[PDB]
Each structure stands twice: as structure tokens, then as C-alpha cells.
Design a protein around this ligand. Structure first.
Ligand SMILES: CCCCCCCCCCCCCCCC(=O)[C@@H](N)CO
Lengths: 423, 49, 492
């Protein structure tokens, strides 16, 4: 074929693209908000005293003295790091204790602890779904679900947000291809991947209809509980307790320990028949070091506090309803979410054609609000990587720490600032 | 005594054949197959050779 | 590439008889696994394994049987060698919670006894920073009191703290690079930042024995992945030549980028990457280098700066330097170091920076204190002494093991020591016999190693004294006599 001289000329004349493309200096995500001290209620952000309405600390367990005391006890017992994976002496008694406590809390047979909140579902999904399987995923699914779906090589069938007619149409179509080819159908697995409370929309899934569709079309259900794990239900057990569904009807329930438990990590709970697979198939579990014992003890103490006092979920619900009702009626903003959601959104009623203009407007509102002692944050996404990119929005997060008058003041300040900016 | 030496030899046989990983009845099944094959081989060898 | 110091690695070939016996053992054990599946099929024996619920028996089965044939029949039989719970700080000596199984490792019952003072060869603490007392523990306690455990947001959101910026500045000064960024998990560091650097139209030249995180990061990005032989610079150079000359496969367009993923130390093999040759090749062929430096960032280097310092090379020649804080520093997390442009792009476009929770404040404080101890800012010579002590332990242990007659893989300077067991039954036997003799070791087979070469990995530590090493070596000699594990022909 080619001469050696031609090949060396080709090698000489090849110029690769730069490793990273040039990044605009006027990038919103380029400027981080520096928080001085803990990210708690009444925090300091960018050198300003502010009431926190941004961090996903729903139950106020970040600066709970009991949680800190438990974490300090575990720190003095074990130190910080685990120095190995769960397979190789990285399993402490705190990890087994936390798994047992989570399984007993969720009324399930088994739970598995991941050391990273993204990784728990990004590794749970590929473990069960393989090449040739069909996954029906809500289009408004979080990025971790998307990367778990990409890591598996299965077919992906996005259906419209909370639309059971769209999901049922997709299922009937898949039934048609099942009729066309029987042998491949007998070995093809079907998964419905949903999120109990969606972070990108602040809405709740139609779980009873999901269960009925699961039994009619024989598709196992994976349920993401990152937002709803500690906020929903009488005992704060998730959307299953909210709707009254038996937890056995859900094949996998994955949450992260970072929002309500206020510590690093994630977990997946379900029947041992399902969970035992991940201990050898979950890549984020097998090939990563286990969670530090102090974080595990903090999570255990958070579980103790949630079990001892289940009125925190009631006060969280009433505060969510209060802020949701108060925020209704903004001149240029629309509240996107449900009254029972602790984290919802404030999107633009009329969006300019350019998305970065919308982001700049929302950041103007956010900055003027931080000048007024309110720490708000704008929902950040990877524009190119997101499958269904959500609209730019300001994220409103409710916490039991935020008092009633603080909620009213936050609503009024947001109203005034937004009506000034959008005028 | 030398019985302990033969016990170590049996242990080495277990390690090599992976019978160490198996349950006692699986070990008995394997040994029955082994002595059966040995007997058939000895029978054929004496009959012709 | 030019080597200032000699580069001595040995990977002795498997003895022919040993490989034959390994195949025989695997074959008989697979036949017995087939018999076990047949027996369980007509329920001749009870099923200890869990089964799909009756309401869901008409679904397509969740697992294909043959897929877990390994897990149920191969791995389950010697499962007691893994997931051993520890109830103490994983230092040189660790406390193991004794457990027993009356159903052949299907379920374990935890006896009240605790096995105390086990010589720890499994944990990663190379520099002995796994302590429950000391300055790092006190600093972490103070920061835990001030901040609490965990943060409840993302870096791009309100989850960026002054602790994170302090840590990133310190890490950049430690490595020798312009800038660095920190992540909550090293596996996440790889899987979430490789997709940001490269995409479709780029090429990833990945080592044969790369970590699962590197493989996942390469797969999540849409780039083409080509595998070269482990530390084979001839194979890598041939791949680079062909990739540049022939372009992308379907349409022979020139590649946008070529990224070479290598590791500083490959833990399972114990080999140190041929970094001078890799840097020479990437300079000649205009490739980019991604150096995963998890097992060498504290373990290697006269001052513990990693493989780059170990070879005396310029840190600026490596485009991306991954590292992990778990192995040597004694705290979870990961980092990427590089030029300021790279780190700014990653802060903007990393998946972890946008969607994943930040590092825990006590964890970053322990990392900060350990790093300052290593780089001499603690005001005490303890950080240096750790580096010389780890080097001495590595040399002593490797020399003693090799002159005992075992087959030891890897570079002579690598603190991870893989010892070849080569037989599936010996994998379980070695772990059980070593724990019986009060040494905790790690044994690995298929999910981490290839078929014939199953091994036992010793992680050496600066916490290990010479008395501890002597005890471990004496028991290893005894067990190698017992299990006939001295397969070497060259030395014994
Ligand atoms: C005959 C049957 C043999 C059975 C062999 C099974 C072996 C199980 C190994 C599981 C753990 C792997 C951890 C990898 C280390 C790592 O990724 C670190 N970098 C994380 O800290």
C-alpha cells in the first residue's frame, strides 16, 4: 500500500485538536459561589450573610449535634479513610450496620451502600440491563440515570414526562415486536426506570399506574428516590409510602444518602435476589473504596433521628406547601413543581429565544437576592450532554430549619427582585 | 507418622484437583469416578497387555 | 525515553505443568458446577440461593443462568476470603470480626469472637496515614465540628466551600502543576472526567490492564477504544502509527485527538508504567497523556510525588494527571491535575462538577493534613520518614519473597507484591491458611485477573515494622511449603 515516506509525511503533517477547547471568560459556571463555613441555614456565600434556600438539606441534619457526635465517635474509633474496597478489608461493622438499618427502615430484605451518590444508580442500572434489553425511561430523568443507561448497552425508549399513555403506547409497540420475533422476546428483558420525585421538574411519578403497567407488560421497575427518600410518606420512606404501594412491587429502589441524610454516599434497596447481584456486578461498588466510617455513622444517626421523630416530614410538608403557595403569582416567573416537593423550580414564563439570555436574567435575580440575604441557586446542567435538556430555572429548596416568616420573606424578596428584573 | 505424610499427599491431591473447594459428597463422587476409570483401565491393560 | 535509574521488572512465565493442572482443576470444578445446576433444576437439593418471587415468575428471567455460573459455582465456594468485616482502624494490625457459614458460604453467621492483631497486608495505607490518633485526626475532628459530615449541594451550585478551594490549591502545589480539581470519588473522577476530555472522532489508546474506572470513562465517551499490550511500547507505537496514518475506521478522516490512558502502578501486576518511553512517544506522535496515578502518588518518588518524580521527569509533560487520595493519604476522593486551562474546562464541564455532591469537609481536612505532612509543612520529619520506610519495606519484602522461591510479578520498587497461586483451590486455601496464621491477605481471580494467573496481593505500608514483616514472611514461607506455592525456577 502506502510508501514509508508517505506514511512519515502523514505523521508529520497531522495536527491534533487541543485537549480542551477555549472556554469563554463570561461563563456562568466558571464563577463558583465560595461558601465560607458550613453550607447550613444562615450561611455566608460570596462574603454575604444569607439564608440558605439552595442546599438539599431537607431535614436540617447537617449541623445536628447528634449527627456530629456520632460522626466524631466513629472518627475516633476508625479514622477517616477505609483504605480499600468492600471486598478487601474495606468492610467495617459500620457499613453492615448501615445496610441493616436502611433495609429495616425501608421494610426491604437487603440494602447495598455505595460511597458516591451518582455512582449508586449509574452502576445499579448497568448491572441488570445488558445488550438487547429494552429500558423505558422517563425523559425527564436525572443525569445519573442517563449515564447508567448509557453504560448499559440496552435499547432506550424515552417516554413523555409522567405520561402513562405514552408509556403504554411504547409497551404495546414493544409487544408487537415481541409477536414478530418470539425467541428473542423470550430472552429480552424489560425495565421501566422512573424517579420517585424528579429533580428536573419537581413532580411526582404515577406509581400505581406504573405498577399496573409493570404487571400487564412484565417490565421490572427501577425507582430513583434521591429527593423523595426522606421527605415523602408518613414515616419518610419514599413515594411508595406516599402512594401506599407495597415495596415488593418495586424491583429496585435507589437513593443517595446526601440530601435528607446529609452525608456522602448512596444506597440501593430491594429483595436480596436483586441486591446480591450488585455486590459483584456494581462497578462503583466493586472497584471503589468503601464509604468512610464517619459518614456511615452520620447516616446511621440520621436514620435514628428520622425514626424517632416522624413529625419532621409533616413540618417539611407544611413548609413546602407554604412556600409553594406564596411563590404563586410572580409576574415573570412560573413555579414548576408540586406542592409536596421540597425542591422545585422557578422558570421564566416568557423565554427569550437565546438560552444564555435566560440564564443571565435568572442569574440577575439570584444575585440581587443574595444581596438581600437569600441564598438561591440556578439549576446547572451540561447543555450538550443532557438528553432532554430542561429549561433554565432558579431552584427553590425547602428545609425544616427555614422558619415560617423566613419563608414568607424569601417569597416576597423573590417576587420583588424578579418583578424588577423582568420589567 | 508416615500416615501424616500420606495425609499431606491427599491434601495436595485435593488442592491440585480442586476437590478442596467441593463438598464431601462431591469429593466422594469424583473419587468413585476415579477408581472406576482406574479399574476399567487396569482390566483392559491386563486383558490385552 | 532515557532511564536515569535501572528499570527492573520480572514476570516469570507460568510453568507448563502448573498451567495444565490449573486447566484440569477449573474444568473439573466447572463440570461439578454443571452437575450442581442440574441437581438444583429438579430440586434434588434445596436452593440456598434466592429466587424470583411467585408474582414475577412469568417475566423474562432477570439473570441468564450461564452469566452467573461463575458466581454461584466458582466464587461462592471460597467466598469467605472476601468481604471480611473489620472492627478496627486498618493499620499494620487490624481486628477482623470472625464469621462462619454452615451452608458453604451461602450465608455467614457472625460469632462473637474478634480476631485481634491481624497483620494487615490487604489495606492500601502505603504511608501509614490510617490512624485513629494524630494530627490529621485532630484536624479532621475540628473541621467536622465546624462543618459537619457531608455537603448537600454541587460545586457549581452552593456546594463549593473554601475548604475545597484550599485543597485544590494545595494539591496543585503538591503535584507541581498549574492547577488541580478534587472529586468525591476516584472511580467517579475517571468515569466522569474522561468523557469530558474526548468524544466521538477521538481515539483512546488504553492499556490492556487498565482499571475498570478508566475503561468505563473511555466507554462513556464516544471515542474509539484500541487496546495495546501491557507496558509494550512497541505495541503502543505501532498503534499510534496506524491510528495517525489510516484515520477513523469507517471514513478514513484524521482523528480529532489521540488520548493514551495509562496507570502509574498497575496494582494487580505490580508493574510501574514505562513513563519516559510513553512521554517520548506522545511527544513524537502528538498524543495526549492521561496518567492515573492512584497507586503511586504517595508510594513512589523520593518525596512521594508519584511516578513522575520517581522517573525524574517534568510534571508538565503529562497532559492530565489523575490521582486518588484513598491509597496513600488515608481518605476518600480523587483529583485531576494539569494546566489552568484544563482545570477551568473541567470545572465548567465535568459531570461530577455539575451533578455530583462535593467532597466531605472532614475528608478534605484529613487530605490537607496528610499532604502537608508529606511535603514537609507539618514542621516534623514524619512525612519523609514514611517515604524512606515504605521504600525499605518494599525492597526487603520483595527480596525476601523472591529468594524464598515464589513467583513475584512487577517492578522491584512497587509496594504492591503479587504472588502467583495459579490454581483455583489454592486461592481459597491461601487465604484461609494465612488468616489461620494471623495474616490478612487479598486473593483475586477472574473479576480482577485473567484466567490462569490468579494471585495474592500484598500491600506494603510504612506502618509495617521489620518485626511485622519478618512474622509475615515466616508464615508465608510456612504456607508456601504447605501449599506448594514456590513455582520459581530461577531462585529458591
Ligand atoms: C475460583 C473463584 C475465584 C474468585 C475471585 C473473586 C475476586 C473478587 C474481587 C472483588 C474486589 C475488587 C477490588 C478492586 C480494587 C480497586 O479497584 C481499588 N482501586 C479501589 O480502591
Amino acid at each position: 500500500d502506502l510508501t514509508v515516506k508517505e506514511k512519515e509525511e502523514l505523521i508529520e503533517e497531522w495536527q491534533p485538536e487541543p485537549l480542551v477547547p477555549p472556554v469563554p471568560k463570561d461563563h456562568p459556571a466558571l464563577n463558583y459561589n465560595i461558601v465560607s463555613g458550613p453550607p447550613s441555614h444562615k450561611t455566608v456565600v460570596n462574603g454575604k450573610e444569607c439564608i440558605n434556600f439552595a442546599s438539599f438539606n431537607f431535614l436540617g441534619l447537617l449541623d445536628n449535634p447528634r449527627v456530629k457526635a456520632a460522626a466524631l465517635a466513629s472518627l475516633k474509633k476508625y479514622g477517616v479513610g477505609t483504605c480499600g474496597p468492600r471486598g478487601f478489608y474495606g468492610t467495617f461493622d459500620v457499613h453492615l450496620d448501615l445496610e441493616d438499618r436502611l433495609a429495616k427502615f425501608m421494610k426491604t430484605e437487603e440494602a447495598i451502600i455505595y460511597s458516591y451518590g451518582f455512582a449508586t444508580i449509574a452502576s445499579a442500572i448497568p448491572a441488570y440491563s445488558k445488550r438487547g434489553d429494552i429500558v423505558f425511561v422517563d425523559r425527564a430523568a436525572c443525569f445519573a440515570i442517563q449515564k447508567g443507561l448509557q453504560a448499559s448497552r440496552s435499547d432506550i425508549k424515552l417516554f413523555k414526562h409522567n405520561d402513562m399513555a405514552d408509556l403504554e403506547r411504547l409497551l404495546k409497540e414493544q409487544e408487537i415486536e415481541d409477536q414478530k420475533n418470539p425467541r428473542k422476546a423470550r430472552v429480552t428483558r424489560r425495565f421501566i426506570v422512573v424517579e420517585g420525585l424528579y429533580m428536573n421538574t419537581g413532580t411526582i411519578c404515577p406509581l400505581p399506574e406504573l405498577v399496573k403497567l409493570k404487571y400487564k407488560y412484565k417490565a421490572r421497575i427501577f425507582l430513583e428516590e434521591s429527593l423523595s427518600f426522606g421527605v415523602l410518606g408518613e414515616h419518610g420512606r419514599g413515594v411508595t409510602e406516599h402512594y401506599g404501594i407495597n415495596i415488593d412491587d418495586i424491583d429496585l429502589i435507589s437513593a443517595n444518602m446526601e440530601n435528607a441524610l446529609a452525608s456522602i454516599g448512596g444506597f440501593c434497596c430491594g429483595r436480596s435476589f436483586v441486591i446480591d447481584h450488585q455486590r459483584l456486578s456494581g462497578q462503583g461498588y466493586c472497584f471503589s473504596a468503601s464509604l468512610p466510617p464517619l459518614l456511615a455513622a452520620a447516616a446511621i444517626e440520621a436514620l435514628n433521628i428520622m425514626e424517632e421523630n416522624p413529625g419532621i416530614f409533616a413540618v417539611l410538608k407544611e413548609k413546602c406547601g407554604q412556600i409553594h403557595k406564596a411563590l404563586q403569582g410572580i409576574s415573570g416567573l412560573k413555579v414548576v413543581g408540586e406542592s409536596l416537593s421540597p425542591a422545585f423550580h422557578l422558570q421564566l414564563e416568557e423565554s427569550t429565544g437565546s438560552r444564555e439570555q435566560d440564564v443571565r436574567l435568572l442569574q440577575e435575580i439570584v444575585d440581587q437576592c443574595m444581596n438581600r440575604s437569600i441564598a438561591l441557586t440556578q439549576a446547572r446542567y451540561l447543555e450538550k450532554e443532557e438528553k432532554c435538556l430542561p429549561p433554565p430555572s432558579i431552584r427553590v429548596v425547602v428545609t425544616v430549619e427555614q422558619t415560617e416568616e423566613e419563608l414568607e420573606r424569601a417569597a416576597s424578596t423573590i417576587k420583588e427582585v424578579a418583578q424588577a428584573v423582568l420589567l | 507418622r508416615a500416615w501424616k505424610q500420606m495425609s499431606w499427599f491427599y491434601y495436595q491431591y485435593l488442592l491440585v484437583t480442586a476437590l478442596y473447594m467441593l463438598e464431601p459428597w462431591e469429593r466422594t463422587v469424583f473419587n468413585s469416578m476415579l477408581v472406576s476409570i482406574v479399574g476399567m483401565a487396569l482390566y483392559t491393560g491386563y486383558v490385552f497387555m | 525515553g532515557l532511564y536515569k535509574r535501572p528499570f527492573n521488572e520480572a514476570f516469570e512465565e507460568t510453568p507448563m505443568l502448573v498451567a495444565v493442572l490449573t486447566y484440569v482443576g477449573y474444568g473439573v470444578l466447572t463440570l461439578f458446577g454443571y452437575l450442581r445446576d442440574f441437581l438444583r433444576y429438579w430440586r434434588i437439593e434445596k436452593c440456598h440461593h434466592a429466587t424470583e418471587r411467585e408474582e414475577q415468575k412469568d417475566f423474562v428471567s432477570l439473570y441468564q443462568d450461564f452469566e452467573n455460573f461463575y458466581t454461584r459455582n466458582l466464587y461462592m465456594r471460597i467466598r469467605d476470603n472476601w468481604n471480611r468485616p473489620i472492627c478496627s482502624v486498618p493499620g499494620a494490625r487490624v481486628d477482623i470480626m470472625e464469621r462462619q457459614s454452615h451452608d458453604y458460604n451461602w450465608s455467614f453467621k457472625y460469632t462473637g469472637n474478634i480476631i485481634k492483631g491481624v497483620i494487615n497486608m490487604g489495606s492500601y495505607n502505603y504511608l501509614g496515614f490510617a490512624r485513629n490518633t494524630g494530627s490529621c485526626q485532630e484536624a479532621a475532628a475540628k473541621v467536622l465540628e465546624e462543618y459537619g459530615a457531608g455537603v448537600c449541594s454541587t460545586r457549581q451550585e452552593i456546594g463549593n466551600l473554601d475548604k475545597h478551594e484550599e485543597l485544590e490549591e494545595l494539591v496543585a502545589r503538591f503535584l507541581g502543576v498549574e492547577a488541580a480539581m478534587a472529586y468525591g470519588m476516584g472511580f467517579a473522577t475517571n468515569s466522569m472526567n474522561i468523557p469530558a476530555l474526548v468524544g466521538k472522532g477521538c481515539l483512546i489508546l488504553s492499556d490492556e490492564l487498565n482499571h475498570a474506572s478508566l475503561v468505563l470513562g473511555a466507554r462513556l465517551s464516544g471515542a474509539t477504544i484500541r487496546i495495546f499490550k501491557h507496558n509494550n511500547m512497541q505495541s503502543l507505537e505501532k498503534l499510534l502509527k496506524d491510528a495517525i496514518v489510516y484515520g477513523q475506521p469507517r471514513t478514513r478522516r484524521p482523528w480529532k485527538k489521540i488520548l493514551i490512558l495509562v496507570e502509574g502502578i498497575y496494582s494487580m501486576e505490580g508493574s510501574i508504567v514505562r513513563l519516559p518511553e510513553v512521554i517520548a512517544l506522545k511527544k513524537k506522535y502528538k498524543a495526549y497523556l492521561y496518567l492515573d496515578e492512584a497507586h503511586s502518588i504517595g508510594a513512589l518518588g523520593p518525596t512521594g510525588r508519584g511516578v513522575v518524580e520517581y522517573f525524574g521527569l517534568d510534571p508538565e509533560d503529562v497532559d492530565v494527571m489523575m490521582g486518588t487520595f484513598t491509597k496513600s493519604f488515608g481518605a476518600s476522593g480523587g483529583y485531576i491535575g494539569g494546566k489552568k486551562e484544563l482545570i477551568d474546562y473541567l470545572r465548567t464541564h465535568s459531570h461530577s462538577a455539575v451533578y455530583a455532591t462535593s467532597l466531605s469537609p472532614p475528608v478534605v481536612e484529613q487530605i490537607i493534613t496528610s499532604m502537608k505532612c508529606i511535603m514537609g509543612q507539618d514542621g516534623t520529619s514524619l512525612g519523609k520518614e514514611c517515604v524512606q520506610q515504605l521504600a525499605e519495606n518494599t525492597r526487603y519484602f520483595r527480596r525476601r519473597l523472591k529468594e524464598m522461591g515464589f513467583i513475584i510479578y512487577g517492578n522491584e520498587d512497587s509496594p504492591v507484591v503479587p504472588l502467583m497461586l495459579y490454581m483455583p483451590a489454592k486461592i481459597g486455601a491461601f487465604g484461609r491458611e494465612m488468616l489461620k496464621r494471623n495474616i490478612g491477605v487479598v486473593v483475586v481471580g477472574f473479576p480482577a485477573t485473567p484466567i490462569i494467573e490468579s494471585r495474592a496481593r500484598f500491600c506494603l505500608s510504612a506502618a509495617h515494622t521489620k518485626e511485622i514483616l519478618d512474622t509475615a514472611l515466616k508464615e508465608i514461607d510456612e504456607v508456601g511449603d504447605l501449599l506448594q506455592l514456590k513455582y520459581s525456577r530461577h531462585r529458591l
